[PDB]
Design a protein around this ligand. Structure first.
Ligand SMILES: Oc1ccc2c(c1)OCO2
Length: 167
């Protein structure tokens, strides 16, 4: 049993809810929250900007030190950093950004990072301002992630479309 509430069950391991990922993290304090990161860990907008704002910019400060030491992530890659006030850990995962021309086949590699964690609170990778089709992102998630993933979909309209089109 875990603390996640109000989710619709899609599969054995994937759950979904219409929720503000920031507000969900603040309530649950999950072991892992996933950030929709870019390779520079520049948390300007979208899910990343919202998560970082909720940490009072402490996520960005930590991220800048990580990049100064290690250099940029790979598209499809990840790193584990602090979850600050939102979670124990933040898994920063880089899905391909269609608005930068990145290979959508890298979305499966991005979701494979989730398999290193038994339970996660996450957004749909490459959705929103990353430009991919969220229906596609949900299908890759279900077909790639084997650990238990609780998806927070910010848009009520999109949530209803994801559920009503789910195969
Ligand atoms: O994709 C998003 C998810 C949550 C957000 C957001 C964007 O901006 C405000 O909070």
């Amino acid at each position: 049993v875990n603390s996640f509430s109000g989710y619709l069950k899609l599969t054995d391991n994937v759950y979904i809810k219409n929720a503000d990922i920031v507000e969900e993290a603040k309530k649950v304090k999950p072991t892992v929250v996933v950030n929709a990161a870019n390779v520079y860990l520049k948390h300007g907008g979208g899910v990343a900007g919202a998560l970082n704002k909720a940490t009072n910019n402490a996520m960005q400060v930590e991220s800048d030190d990580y990049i100064a030491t290690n250099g940029p992530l790979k598209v499809g890659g990840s790193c584990v950093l602090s979850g600050h006030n939102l979670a124990k850990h933040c898994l920063h995962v880089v899905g391909p950004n269609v608005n930068k021309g990145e290979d959508i086949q890298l979305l499966k590699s991005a979701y494979e990072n989730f398999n290193q964690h038994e339970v996660l609170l996450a957004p749909l990778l490459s959705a929103g301002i990353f430009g991919a089709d969220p229906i596609h992102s949900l299908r890759v998630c279900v077909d790639t992630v084997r650990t238990n993933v609780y998806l927070a979909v910010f848009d009520k309209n999109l949530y209803d479309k994801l559920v009503s089109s789910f195969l």
